[PDB]
From a paper:
The FgγC peptide binding site is located in a cleft between N2 and N3. The r.m.s.d between the structures of free and FgγC-bound rFnBPA(189–505) is 0.81 Å, confirming that binding of FgγC does not induce large conformational changes in the individual N2 and N3 domains or in their relative orientation. The translocation of the N3 G′ strand is the only significant change. The combined buried surface area within the rFnBPA(189–505)·FgγC A·C chain interface is 1880 Å2. In contrast to the apo-protein structure, no electron density was detected within the N3 loop (residues 479–489) that connects the F′ and G′ strands. Clearly, the latch β-strand residues are absent in the FnBPA(189–505)·FgγC structure.
The adjacent fibrinogen (Fg)- and fibronectin (Fn)-binding sites on Fn-binding protein A (FnBPA), a cell surface protein from Staphylococcus aureus, are implicated in the initiation and persistence of infection. The N-terminal region of FnBPA contains three subdomains N1–N3; N2N3 binds fibrinogen (Fg) and elastin. Here, we solved the structure of the N2N3 domains containing the Fg-binding site of FnBPA in the apo form and in complex with a Fg peptide.
Residue numbers in the entry:
A (entry chain A): 195 to 430, 432 to 479, 489 to 503
B (entry chain C): 4 to 17
Write the structure that this text describes.
Amino acid sequence: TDVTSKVTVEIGSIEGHNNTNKVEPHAGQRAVLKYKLKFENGLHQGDYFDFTLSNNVNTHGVSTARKVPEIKNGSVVMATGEVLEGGKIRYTFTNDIEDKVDVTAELEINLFIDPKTVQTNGNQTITSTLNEEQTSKELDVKYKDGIGNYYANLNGSIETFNKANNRFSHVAFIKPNNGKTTSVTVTGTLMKGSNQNGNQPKVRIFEYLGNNEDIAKSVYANTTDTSKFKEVTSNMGNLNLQNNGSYSLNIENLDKTYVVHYDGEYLNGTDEVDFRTQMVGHPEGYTLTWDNGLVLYSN
Amino acid sequence: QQHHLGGAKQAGDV
């Protein structure tokens, strides 16, 4: 049975990073949902309750696993959680709820600002709604800007991190600024995580066809949108892929913004990947170096 | 002047 109506939020709060009213997702920061819940008596194994998070956050961030912490009384698992569709979290009770009296439980869940839904700096109201009770927090969200010079800006973001299968994905934006750059070489290197005995990464190259103002400050690239991203991987003799996870790419004319999407493996036993993108450019030479790393959090 | 370096970190669970 849906027993959402049987759950009281005794205490509910959302906090920014380091109990401030701000989150800087490109500095690996997150927000936190804290619940103290009361449950009416008479619940059973398989009964469940839901709450819903605003679409500006999720519970995974760069991770591909969609998990949520168990509700426990001591070491006893009272309910297990799942991430469902549209911001919904559902907790389903175990046999240990049966015949218990005056049950309460504490839940703490890390909330990661979603770069697809929060694409620019701004104030975001984060909400968690359980049984009509809305827990709310206005947070400042601020992103980084990449690294630039007179001729170009280089930026990038880890898109996914898949621990279970030892794979990650990453996107880099290579953007011209003023003057004319030729003979650009762009490289990607695993600074931590390279598997010398592995497979070559899958590297796709895209022309960005939109305006520069509309590039998400969050760093998000919907590369399936062929109106925004024109794949030119095939046009590009100019791409060298290595079994250690590295690539090098030559762009002859940086007359527009290029996007490199990378999908590769990393070495078993590596806690976290560190990925470096470096660009060398020639005005009509300079280097831009951009590092992407990870900050991983437990519930 | 000729070489600039920066970086970022993404958050996620685990």
